[PDB]
Ligand binder design. Structure first.
Ligand SMILES: [Cl-]
Ligand SMILES: [Cl-]
Ligand SMILES: [Cl-]
Ligand SMILES: [Cl-]
Ligand SMILES: [Cl-]
Ligand SMILES: [Cl-]
Ligand SMILES: [Cl-]
Ligand SMILES: [Cl-]
Ligand SMILES: [Cl-]
Ligand SMILES: [Cl-]
Ligand SMILES: [Cl-]
Ligand SMILES: [Cl-]
Ligand SMILES: [Li+]
Ligand SMILES: [Li+]
Ligand SMILES: [Li+]
Ligand SMILES: [Mn+2]
Ligand SMILES: [Mn+2]
Ligand SMILES: [Mn+2]
Ligand SMILES: [Mn+2]
Ligand SMILES: [Mn+2]
Ligand SMILES: [Mn+2]
Ligand SMILES: [Mn+2]
Ligand SMILES: [Mn+2]
Ligand SMILES: [Mn+2]
Ligand SMILES: [Mn+2]
Ligand SMILES: [Mn+2]
Ligand SMILES: [Mn+2]
Lengths: 302, 302, 302, 302, 302, 302
């Protein structure tokens, strides 16, 4: 079972301008083959399907726990896309929009028109070409070593996509998210590499980084390394998965320093609200009446 | 962000033997169009994309919280499938399997061979025809009423699929899971119906049940209603989503009794471990050496 | 624009009992690559997209009119599938079905479980592997000769699929439908071949039949030829497409006899009603109340 | 069976300029998830699959008839796209096009290159991202109420997409089509809502409009309401489906006035011909010789 | 079995500038429905599946051999795309690229972002809309005449796409490849047409060209015809498939001159190397260390 | 460019009778995600897209050459499937088949009906669920180490699928093919592992085998190892790719013995001809006339 905390994993900056094509590129990191939906669903299904949940417990704890972290990463990437698509971020009401004035005219010419037609200027479950995420992006073979080898690869392929998208947009909201997730993905790659070394004797972490560029060269990633976050494997569970430190120990690939398990999630930051976009009818064309209904739900004695 | 608890939402019984074609049918309820992946991802993305998270908070709390519950439902359905596919449930080591003796010969003739080739006799992210789940199964328009109308439909369409699969499968593991999720889906349909009543004045809950068959006609569902589970909307969060009772109040469609918000998740039941399947090389062909590696990790613990 | 007549293009017989796997095979002829959806949508879109609707009118009339005929062919193939899937054909109310008794147990083991889960034991928009029909099965290039060459091929490929499914299914409903549509597909291939002869001088009809087997070897098709149906190109329009005989003239490939344009549709046969299937909740679990509602609508008629 | 009338459902204006990206957006309304292909094929297959064609006749008449109207809507949307893609609308011959001069250079940079490569600058069976329409967009459950609930949703989701595309392009051909189809979709939503109220007692039409914006705010829709077309359910059949008025009666959601059944289709307007586009080889590179062949087919004595 | 020669089928010119959208259009010719992947895989699988490899040997030789030629065409089209995507063609090392400087900023706005995210600025197995090539683009019916009819169509549909893409870009690398492959596709269409005439008596080559525009009107195609290459069917085999001349004989459709079989491949040209693209991390971010490792592999005594 | 040799990489035995479901399982090894189409197309596109073809030549030679070997593997797997689907292997003419007698009745009930409808009882470009192979199964990042890591994984994932299908199918044709390709896949995994060791210092070959089962436990694979085939990397080229031994050297993972580069392809075995299947109209319904046409082509030879 799962619980939810109404917080993003980190604070994101306020966007300052809508940037559709940046949002379309960032979609690769959400619903593309190596996006966060893929790391999430790979680890989630491997955790469901895991044989030897007690006999191979440290490895089960690892996959079950990292799957849980990736839930917050789909959330964070979706918030980033929503930030880039928001017309009036954080504002409950805009007035004066007339459909006949062609208020979505710009959207005719952007790469991803679906953001504005199917979505209400919001994230979709798709990649940078509009391709919807598909369950064949999941590998769940039942063989622990084969799955871990796949997962090591998956994290460094995902990192490669994050780096390339970083190089496509200088939007600060996108770069903040990417910097943080480069650091988290470095932790995951390192953790799967340590798990493989424990099972096989092959020193997989010595292959890192892939590609051969250090996170310290990406300013927004270095920001988070400077706070120590490359050392931390957070245990996203009240009472379970307590044996992570049997694998998550020893040296960090980033700097050689000792890594640690942190019990519980990080503090986080607030969730994002894109505000009213009347041309998208989101959350309604003129939402004042609905806001009044919600207000009155609280005004009650019962 | 999210947290994980290593418990299924209910306990499941143990099948007498593998039932591949039952597993293949139950896949519809996991990765098909109206499976638990779809309800999960619809509500998850709607919750990310929600505009007016404070101004429309009671409705945000509802979608965000039900999304969290559906995480445990993909888990529960996967456990059911895994139970039906497990050769040696709960048994860590089998001996004597010879690949040269065609130990997977039965799988040549089952509906879903992928369970045994791509999977290690485990669940996959697909429906009852082998169709992989796809992101176009998600509807996230940004318009609250349109989304809620969709979600009401989604729950009763999902219910219809659960009922039909129930009528195909006599296996207790499937009947228990389905009976439970018929009751939970009744709660979700009722909740979305109450939300639509509040926003629109249209008495959506009066349309229930769809199809026009009572959950009381399904023995396992009747048991869960006798335990009160049709009344309960669990708050799957440490501290958030405390306004569910503004919508989740009044009469149950099942029996007219007053519905309730329950603080926290249910206690549930143990997770499922399919054990060793040597022919599937899952978790390894001969896993004793890996079990020894894991044991030694604890000896070297700090 | 289009009009509808509540008649199948031929009458169909009644199966003795349900035959799921026959239905699954016949799906190839509905939603597969060379099924009736494909011939329909190819000619429909070509007719929309046709350039030179007046200057090339005889050819426009041909494509526009054959497209209309193919609408009735998707209808006829769907009726055949529905006939094979119907538990109680023609019977409005069945009693005593208990969902708890696994009344759909047989469906666990059939090829196409979707017929019974997604469908209410009814046709779906898919082929013989469960693959849903897709718009990339349409070829609409705008070049008349290229399109007609494609359409000649499409008809003989579709014929080949019909012949192979005929050889799989002994059910009279399927044999009657297929025999009829072998004759109609012979007309369409001949018509496109005559159109290509007129435009190019290449004697395309001399290539027929493809494969090199005569429709006379298929008993149901032989009967329809004995009724003259290989000669007939029906004008499926009140007043339009009156120049079909400019192309549809001269010898039939089947027997050398003169072909004819028939004003209007054939008289055909009754549409099919699969009746009540309570386990499928179709049209309702217990439909008597809805039947009463419908009866009362007539009492309140103006 | 079906008949065809060689007329669009309404007169469309002459385009005045090619607008590829407008055509790409309008594709959402043709082959996207909530485009006219989807409403068409949903109602068509539900009509084939309908159980109780006599016992539930008014409801059968409704679905069978609206399916037939949607055939003319795929035609109308395709004509709109073709208008936007036409280089020389209504002109049989253009001269002087040289392939080596890069006459399709603009198409390199438009969103939808397929319009110009796969199509001969014509409509395709796809949405606004190039996604081809797929049969999984059809819902045909066999349960009347569940299908009608789906269809109500489908019409208002389709309306939402039409409104958003309207707001993306000010092209008069697109806006004329959209205005008309907003009015027709309002009729369909109202009709399915009335059918649901008759079966369930739930006042579904009181939820309209969705989104909460009136068609009267869209000038091209108000044009058609001012002619009375929101009141009219046309019976697209010579002799069948005569019981529509048992459901289609009472108040219009638009203005409270009494709705009516109209026997037969509206008058319509001419079909559209995009003319010669030599660079697309459509209908031929230099079509004069083919036009002469067609002319000579008429010059005959026989 | 197969052998490889490290040469393109022709010399291509050096690109001079990156042209992403030209590369995206040329993708239609690689991984689209009528691209070189399709002609390749159609003929390859037909050759595997061929019945009567001795009894119908000349026809087997034809399909087996043309399949082999198409391997070099996927190679040639991929080289063309890679040329259009190359930043530093032929250069092993570039220095001074900083990811934080947004070196891929242009790629945010191009049609095909996947070239830069999934690919390292390189070709992908997809068409001009980003659609990945799929095995349903292959037709392998087992019936020789039906397959040959399909293949005739396939070549002229492929030619039509090549012509349209030619008209979209004036890039010399693209136009050189297209000119050559127009000539080769003319040979293939002619060869399948001759095979059909031999089997059926229908003069299929008299339909050529389709569309009705001569290759001699395309300067880069005329270049290769002026060298005689429209006459040549190369036998891509050391010792097999020696009976091609039983079919490949008689007049060329281009000019009426006698065609010939050439034993062995043409001379070819060098392969293409896109060079270092540091922002794509291709072949590495800073490849000097890897180049030194490779150099040292040669410095050996053993 | 490529050349073709009309030989399979090994000889195959003849099945006693058709085995449709065995063929359907073996399809996973052809067109599934980890089938031979995937290894082929991964290495083919990586070889096209390779940057530093001279500076990193030993690695280019390896990928380019292994790609060529995989061409013969799609051929070999297709031959295996065709063998399992052949009614009359090696027999040019069968008499007496009557389509009216349901000669394909068995095919109604097999897993893969497409083999008999779309195919003429022959292989298709799909996996074990009927899923067509797709280009998103290719990973071509441009980064050498990332690609090689992927390829190492791909080979062991493909091996895992081969092992599982082996365990499903007792047919000698399948066991021989799979035993051989287990040995060849061991060579490829070892080669990519050696390449990674050279570039990274990580001892990837020490992870082998994956899964942890020796090829010696599979009797057919053991025979091929006893013949030395695990040592051999064949140079599938007349004159190119002469630096394979710079990487392909040192110890075999199977037995510690020195590996070798073999100049040229193996001698292999005959290609397979499925013979006449009249019910499939393959190569024709009654092929005697076409056989006579072919005979006469030789009489008219030059
Ligand atoms: Cl990740
Ligand atoms: Cl991560
Ligand atoms: Cl649900
Ligand atoms: Cl639920
Ligand atoms: Cl047809
Ligand atoms: Cl037909
Ligand atoms: Cl509609
Ligand atoms: Cl409408
Ligand atoms: Cl080609
Ligand atoms: Cl070619
Ligand atoms: Cl392989
Ligand atoms: Cl291999
Ligand atoms: Li069982
Ligand atoms: Li039967
Ligand atoms: Li057998
Ligand atoms: Mn992540
Ligand atoms: Mn990760
Ligand atoms: Mn659920
Ligand atoms: Mn639910
Ligand atoms: Mn037809
Ligand atoms: Mn037809
Ligand atoms: Mn419509
Ligand atoms: Mn409608
Ligand atoms: Mn080619
Ligand atoms: Mn070709
Ligand atoms: Mn291989
Ligand atoms: Mn391999």
């Amino acid at each position: 079972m799962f619980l939810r905390i109404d917080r993003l994993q980190i604070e994101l900056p306020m966007p300052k301008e809508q940037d559709p094509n940046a949002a379309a590129a960032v979609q690769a990191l959400l619903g593309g083959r190596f996006g966060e939906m893929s790391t999430l669903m790979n680890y989630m299904y491997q955790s469901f399907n895991f044989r030897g949940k007690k006999a191979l417990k440290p490895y089960y704890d690892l996959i079950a726990n990292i799957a849980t972290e990736e839930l917050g990463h789909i959330e964070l990437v979706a918030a980033t896309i929503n930030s880039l698509l928001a017309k009036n971020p954080g504002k409950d009401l805009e007035e004066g929009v007339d459909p006949a004035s062609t208020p979505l005219g710009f959207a005719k010419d952007v790469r991803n028109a679906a953001h504005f037609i199917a979505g209400g200027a919001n994230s979709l479950v798709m990649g940078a070409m509009g391709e919807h995420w598909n369950g064949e992006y999941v590998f769940t073979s039942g063989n622990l070593i084969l799955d871990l080898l796949h997962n090591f690869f998956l994290e460094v392929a995902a990192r490669t996509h994050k780096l390339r998208v970083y190089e496509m947009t200088d939007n600060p909201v996108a770069r903040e998210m990417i910097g943080y997730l480069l650091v988290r993905g470095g932790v995951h790659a390192a953790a799967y590499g340590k798990a493989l070394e424990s099972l096989t004797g092959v020193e997989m972490t010595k292959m890192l980084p892939i590609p051969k560029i250090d996170n310290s060269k990406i300013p927004e990633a270095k920001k988070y390394m400077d706070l120590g976050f490359h050392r931390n494997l957070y245990r996203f569970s009240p009472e379970d998965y307590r044996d992570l430190g049997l694998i998550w120990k020893g040296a960090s690939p980033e700097d050689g320093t000792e890594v640690v398990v942190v019990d519980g999630p990080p503090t986080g930051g607030p969730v994002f609200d894109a505000g009213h976009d009347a041309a998208e009818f989101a959350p309604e064309f003129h939402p004042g009446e609905l806001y009044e209904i919600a207000k009155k739900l609280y005004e009650k004695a019962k």
